[PDB]
Amino acid sequence: PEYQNIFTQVQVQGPAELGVDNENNLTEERTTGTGFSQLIGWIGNAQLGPIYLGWFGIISLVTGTLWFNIVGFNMLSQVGYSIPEFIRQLFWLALEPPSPEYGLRMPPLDDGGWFIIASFFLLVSVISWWLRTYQLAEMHKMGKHVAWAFAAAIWLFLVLGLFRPILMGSWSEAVPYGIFPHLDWTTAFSIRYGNLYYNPFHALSIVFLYGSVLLFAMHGATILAVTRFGGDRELEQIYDRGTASERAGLFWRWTMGFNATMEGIHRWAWWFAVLTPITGGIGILLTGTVVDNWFLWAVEHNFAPDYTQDYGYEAYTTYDGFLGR
């Protein structure tokens, strides 16, 4: 069959690229030293590094390391400092949020103090990383779309961790730091407040997540289809339209009656991805503070389905018949 352009047939290697520069002097903070990976060269680029080391990055790294070490050492101490038992129960341990009886006051170290300290460190680290991603775009002379799309997810992060506990007046409304405990928190939160399926904003966030996954599948397939016309060089196609863009647009116009441009599809992708955490945070912020039962809300607003048939196994079969006796 024809070449499908999933793996590269032959690789070439030249002198390492150090990066572009301007009067802002990005070179003064970049590291020296690069590597090449032939295993990754089958899919993408082979050069590894260098990286830019500012102050926001160092602060974020140190503070996130502190949070990681606090959580890990608390989990280790909870098991008796036994390394085999620490390894055995790794997925089951956690650092629990404070008890409901303490409200918004600072709890003791045994019942949530370390949780608050680690949460403060994690918040500082995340904000430092966001500031770094803004500063890099400001110094290379580019737009700030990356910072906005990160802020989109930071919004849901903050809603799940900071704003909602303050609105509900308790530090016990946060999420524990664990693998299985956090899934347990998800399920318990869903059960406690009715059914989260009947929250309209959860449905909207699900809609946008599905749309975003569908849109990347479509765009990846489309770009790999027209790569024989140099379709992967999107910027030059935007500045000077070629046949690849025309064919890509005509495919979708003949398929579903409307199409896009080489620059407009990226706007669609940006918005579908960004709209998910925003709707999710808006929906989460209204739970408990405004609505306490979502199934009752749906019933009162008349979009809860009704069933006619009966309940129970004895209405459909027999216990002996099920066993085959």
């Binding site: 600072m106 003791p108 170290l109 608050i116």
Partner: protein
């Protein structure tokens, strides 16, 4: 001990200042929070109980 000024011949005067400021603020906040967590050194609760 009289020749400790040579640290400025090894380190920049701006990075040290920024790191020192951030470190000092974080440590002070952490110590104040740790003090607030106990039942004997919480000034708010002691003032509340003494009224």
């Amino acid at each position: 001990m009289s020749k400790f000024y040579k640290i400025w011949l090894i380190f920049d005067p701006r990075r040290v200042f920024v790191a020192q400021g951030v470190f000092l603020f974080l440590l002070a906040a952490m110590i104040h929070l740790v003090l607030l967590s106990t039942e004997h050194f919480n000034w708010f609760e002691l003032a509340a109980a003494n009224a």
